[PDB]
Amino acid sequence: PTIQQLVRTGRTQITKKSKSVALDSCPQRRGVCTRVYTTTPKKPNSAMRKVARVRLTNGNEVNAYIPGEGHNLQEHSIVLVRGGRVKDLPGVRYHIVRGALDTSGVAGRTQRRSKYGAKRP
Amino acid sequence: YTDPIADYLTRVRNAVAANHKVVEIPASNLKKEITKILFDQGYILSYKFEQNTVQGSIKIALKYDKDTKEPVIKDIQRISKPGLRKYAGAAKLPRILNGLGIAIVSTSKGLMTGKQAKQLNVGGEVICYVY
Amino acid sequence: MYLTKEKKEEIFAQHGDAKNTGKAEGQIALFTYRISHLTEHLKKNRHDYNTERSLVLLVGKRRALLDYLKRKDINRYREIIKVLNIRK
RNA sequence: UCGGGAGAAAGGUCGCCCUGAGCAAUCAGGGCCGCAGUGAAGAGGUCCAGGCGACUGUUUAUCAAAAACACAGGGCUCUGC
RNA sequence: UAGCUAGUUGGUAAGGUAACGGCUUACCAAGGCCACGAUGGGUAGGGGUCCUGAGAGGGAGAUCCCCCACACUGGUACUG
RNA sequence: UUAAAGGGUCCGUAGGCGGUUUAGUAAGUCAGUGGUGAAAGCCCAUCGCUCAACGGUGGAACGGCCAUUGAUACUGCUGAACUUGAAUUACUGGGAAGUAACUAGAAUAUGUAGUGUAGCGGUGAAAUGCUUAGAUAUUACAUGGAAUACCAAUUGCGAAGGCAGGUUACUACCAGUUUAUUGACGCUGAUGGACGAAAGCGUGGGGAGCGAACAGGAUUAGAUACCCUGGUAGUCCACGCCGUAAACGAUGGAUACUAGCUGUUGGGCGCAAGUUCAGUGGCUAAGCGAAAGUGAUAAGUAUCCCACCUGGGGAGUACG
RNA sequence: UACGUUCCCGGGCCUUGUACACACCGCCCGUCAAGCCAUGGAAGCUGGGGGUGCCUGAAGUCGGUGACCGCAAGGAGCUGCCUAGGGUAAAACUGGUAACUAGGGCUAAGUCGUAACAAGGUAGCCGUACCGGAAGGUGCGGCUGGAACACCUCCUUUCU
């Protein structure tokens, strides 16, 4: 508006709140799972999505989504969370890297092998 | 008032929009200098300095074409304002209408145009610009 | 503040040039007179906000004139405030 | 409840001699003595939380001093000389 | 985060430090800062620079160079 | 204006902006010179690694700062002058503009007295209710409280809230015009001050009608409501307290320009026509707007100042 | 037998209002009951830095004394100020946790009612006060951001 008003109090710039916050601004974070279960999407989708409660190394409890099919993910397993939410499960805001320290990859996968951690046949 | 120069430009703009013939603005040294510059550049037909007032009047005749009138003054605006004064040396003069318009610049010598002052290499304060 | 033509002529002649009804000194004297003669009415009509606001407006006008005098001539300001008992 | 709580709580000096600044007082520097210097006697223990009663006050002389009575304040009702 | 500071503000004489100075001491006065942000809290080494952007701007301060601070955590002095 | 956004309204402190002419300085502004703005890095040009990356050299850049010399058009400062802005004075007027004190009538309620008998009241229909202890109805008188039919309205006044029976006193404000007078004394205005519908709170009166809550009757499957019969606080007065509204023109305050038609309010000039200021409505051109619409009393074209807005919910919520 | 279209049902046209458009057999509101999530209050519990007021205070620089070593200097020995560290007392900031408790967002769309959207069947909304299982009801004031209707009782003038 007025130049005098701008000189008195200028324009306020906001901070642009981040997307992935509970991983300490790191690309990947190691964690241990405590409860691997299945949830439902909101609507109108109908499925049984596989999620796991992961406790990261910085003391943060998050819900991660297991991509693909075929995994072990016992009650205690070392997983590597990377990030990336889903628009179906309310609360799950992270993903697990397939091919990490303890998590399994995929078998019979030939198209998207860089993802899902699959070796070249 | 708050800006006699802004009023002088606004009266001309309103008369051009309303398709008038003459304007009877109040007078002052700066307004007379601007009127002389505009008449030398060819944006107005004629001007008369009318006496018999405590301040004096300036009667300006606006110019239109003899067919498809199309007033030659399309946009006459200000750059310096009483709330923000903008000065510039002889390197930051504007480029009004890509060299096709005029920019009045009050210089240390007098009132000149943005192109007539860059040759003299003097700066000053940009007052207004006309297309 | 019952102001008559004779009272105004007297309050202007007291400061000089009774025909000079535009002098800042005479205007300040008139304002002070009709403020002193109104703050007393406001003591028996304490619920007369309509005249309280007019008294505030007169105070504002007198303060504007006093500021004009202060900015133009520093001596006349002191003289007028000392003779009229204004500014606390 | 703006008055209190509150001396809240928690701490420091105190003797004798000399010098100086000082309004008598007192203060500031040194030195000396003893386990101890307001060297004896007299002079608040404090804090936290709850029940009752706002408070000062009065009460079973001679086993009960209180949460009991009173109290300022609030209310209903009677009374025209 | 609306009051802060009691050697604090100024002065007079000494002690001083390479050197002026409340740097320190003795005496006198109550001053000094504060809405143009004192004080208090959080964060952070600063710059030349790097990325981006038509530009105005915005975001960081690795590697190269300059300045400052530190050497297990703190204090003190000697030699020079 | 209707998408998020004009403070409820004025006064005013700090601050921001400044009518015309003229003299002086040159602080801002402009130009030149000297010093500096390290090296490295980016860009340009040119050479050596077979090209490139890389390296060497040169220029530009480093938008900046200090000293000095000039110009004076614009802003700031000092001095002087002017009336157009502003204010004061004089004459004609203008109003539900405020505060205080008196006073009038109609109507409702109650009481007394006279007449008189079976209903009155209410609803879409009923009932609760008052009545043979004489109601409703009518006449005369008395008591008390609140509000003012006709005038009366896109009227008028007030900064806003708001202001209506009549009279007086004490004030305030506004408009026009032959005057006279001062000479920029002006606009806005964060903190701040004052006023501020109704409802609400404290103390003391008053209480006719209305009536939150509440009690009965009725409707409904139910009716903590709409409907009916009563009714406390309140509505009223004298001192105070809070400071909220769809406090709305959902449109901040100034100044200057830009087509008309048609009413009306108060002035001036007019023997009438009609003309010119100050307010108040309607139609509409250009112009604005996403459109609805606005349109000389702008939401049209400019300048100054203040407040506010930055997806919805959470939320005007939590904490202080 | 039919006086007739004021009512019941269905259909057509014009205008009007709409928060509906798979189009009122629409949309949508609130409480209660069952889960998941994050954030407040709270008797208490447990910490983290920094500040201030006292006591004690190592080494070290700088003063006093120095009756003992030395021929003078000087030193030994006592001792004073300053100050790391330790102890103590009351507060300020801030983190975690806690029986219980208030409200918010979703889940399958469970129970109860139909408050708003048409004149939404009592027009709606704003401020305020009271009341009620709940949406909500009522009193006072204000707005149209509401629909349907929407020109009039007196007809004409003398200075009272």
CSV table of C-alpha atoms (C1' of nucleotides) in Angstrom, one decimal, chain D residues 8-13 30-31 49, chain G residues 44 53-55 64 88-91:
chain,number,residue,atom,x,y,z
D,8,A,C1',8.1,-13.8,54.9
D,9,A,C1',12.1,-16.8,53.8
D,10,A,C1',17.5,-16.5,53.5
D,11,G,C1',22.4,-13.6,55.3
D,12,G,C1',26.5,-9.9,57.1
D,13,U,C1',29.1,-6.5,61.5
D,30,G,C1',45.7,-0.6,60.3
D,31,G,C1',47.4,-3.5,65.0
D,49,A,C1',-1.5,-27.9,52.7
G,44,G,C1',1.9,-34.3,42.0
G,53,G,C1',22.6,-12.9,47.8
G,54,C,C1',26.0,-15.1,51.5
G,55,C,C1',30.0,-18.8,53.5
G,64,G,C1',51.8,-5.5,55.2
G,88,U,C1',23.7,-23.0,50.8
G,89,A,C1',18.7,-20.1,50.3
G,90,A,C1',14.7,-18.0,47.6
G,91,A,C1',13.0,-17.0,42.9
